[PDB]
Amino acid sequence: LSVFGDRSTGETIRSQNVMAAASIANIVKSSLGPVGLDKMLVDDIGDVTITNDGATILKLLEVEHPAAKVLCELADLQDKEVGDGTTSVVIIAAELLKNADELVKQKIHPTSVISGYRLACKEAVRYINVVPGGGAVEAALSIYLENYATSMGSREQLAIAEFARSLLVIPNTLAVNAAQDSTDLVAKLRAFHNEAQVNPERKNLKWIGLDLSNGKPRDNKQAGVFEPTIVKVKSLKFATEAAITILRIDDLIKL
Template sequence: MAQQQGPQQSVGTGLFLNGERETGQDVRTGNVTAALAIANICKSSLGPVGLDKMLVDDIGDVTITNDGATILKQLEVEHPAAKVLVELADLQDQEVGDGTTSVVIIASELLKRGNELVKQGIHPTTIISGFRMALKTAVQHIKKDLVVSVDKLGEENLINSAKTSMSSKILGPESAFFARMAVDAVKSVKMATLVNGKPGFKYPISAIHILKAHGKSSMESHMVNG
């Protein structure tokens, strides 16, 4: 009885994968193009005159928002490089709670400028080293020249800062109410410490706990000391 042989496999070279492998400038350009496409979606929602986005999913549910993280979560992104930007926005939202659109736009612009430098013959490692050097210089400049003590800002400026970050959130219409609560909560965890060897203060956000009570209005929220 004759036996039918299966497909032959090459010995010593491993299994043959039926796919394509791309490298070089074309791949870099494709990654940058995908990142810029994501940034262009969010770009028009940035700033005090940013536009809202109306997002409609497969079943017809409508979401209207100008929050970068919310916009990107609703998108069905398949490109790997674009997914990195979506994850970047999500991480920014988890760690800081604001600036999701800004971080996506800055990251995409850095990729765009870096790609132009690669085309000029500069090695990617050199470009990354330059970016890191620029980061250190920028952080030093911010700490030295731009950081202002909370005591010097005053109560009104703190509340205005909190209002600004709430303008793109669901709480935007009641920003005055929640801005006051947020400022009071952060000031309540103020701790004396040493900053660069000098007496100063820190405000550990992790010391503020948020408890949610279902079935009540958001305007019934209140701060409990202790």
């Protein structure tokens, strides 16, 4: 072969776009939530900009990669449309690509993975239909989508089941930022939501979130921690569309 450029394919190119997207999330993972840590932005001049806003970081961050640039354009669409949730969108998308890359190693085709994420996002919006914050939505969808997966079959279980685990990053990330055992709080958070699905009795706790100040569960219905419904709904639609856009890529051609 004689060409004026390069060419490459295989599992490494999907992983390269996965490892690239994961780097953008980690740049804005610790700054998630109200107790998010500040981060420096050193320009080529030498100056330094310090802030903890995840949206401000992505707008000023510069990473030479095509896959990473998709998440930057992604945050702009979510910003201009709503103006909030750009940090959770980038983090949720990176986790879906991480789990999706693991499925592709298990001989699960991306088109089967993509067809599952389109189904999990659809039913998740139906189950969602303000809303309690603090990871209450992500913990409830993690249980409903895990049960709905067994109803479909046809190579969509692992795709929808991995979509459920990806949502837990939000209460897992907020718990780490609050200096608490995230494995405990996320487990305590899933236990209350699971008891809500077993039976509708009032002894079972319902609509529980996370207390970032005290470090424990908290009924956000009474505590007054809410968000707009369009944020949690569109953030999953944008995150799913971006993971699909990056996961459909299967080749790299340079000139």
